[PDB]
């Protein structure tokens, strides 16, 4: 029975104790959908942009359900939105993802979690995440799982786009997971090793990757906006990046581990 640590590691529970659980914060899980039938997962709304997989509350991959459980473990009162842009196989067209981002914008999502990416992006995709940040949305994305490539950034899109918050993985010891992607694009780190979350069919499992880490930051964003609803995505992002626990060189750790308790008491 996998046991969660990552929530207490970013210091979420300190906010919970003070009554900030992400209430009235719209979090778009732009992923493989969310198994809403999971009794621990409460999904406020959704939309599927996968022509052949038309139910966004049906996660045939399992990845988005894992995302939801972590976002909701960090931010339990957060209105969670199943934006299905990824098929059963966990891949989708950019047009689909863009449609998901477009939707997230259209429906006033406070936070986009895109626990997804790849080696390249597109003008259209950059346009979409930019547009979403211009509209005041906190865009969070996994930095990637490409480890290191010498001096080369291994940070994946859309996380590689300046507008997107790029989230690397540390373990319980704040040690960079060997798989966590690296580059100047790297902003923050968050629990991303053996991360216990919800899986389809009332199941749970540890998963590792910059995706779990991202889900914490998306949750952290939600916690921060539930204390500070009038904070811009800009202020949320600076509060997360500027109060982060310094952990190592920016290329491997960005600013370090997200401390949501510190981020939530930040003075701009
Ligand atoms: Na449910
Ligand atoms: Na970025």
Numbering used by the authors: 2 to 75, 85 to 278
What does the primary publication say about this deposited structure?
Omniligase-1 is a broadly applicable enzyme for peptide bond formation between an activated acyl donor peptide and a non-protected acyl acceptor peptide. The final omniligase variants appeared to have a very broad substrate range, coupling more than 250 peptides in a 400-member library of acyl acceptors, as indicated by a high-throughput FRET assay.
In comparison to the Pre-1 and Pre-2 variants, Pre-3 has the additional mutation A225N at the S1′ pocket that is also present in Oml-1. This remarkable A225N mutation almost doubles the S/H ratio (see above), which asks for a structural explanation. The sidechain of Asn225 in the α-helix close to the active site has a hydrogen bond to the hydroxyl group of Ser125 providing a more restrained position than in Pre-1 or Pre-2. The Cα-Cα distances increase by 0.4 Å for residue 225 and Val68 and by approximately 1 Å for Cys221 and His64. In summary, the A225N mutation could improve the S/H ratio by shortening the Cys221 helix in the same way as the P225A mutation, creating space for the cysteine. The A225N substitution also widens the S1′ binding pocket by pushing His64 and Cys221 apart, which is facilitated by formation of H-bonds to nearby residues and to two water molecules in the S1′ pocket.
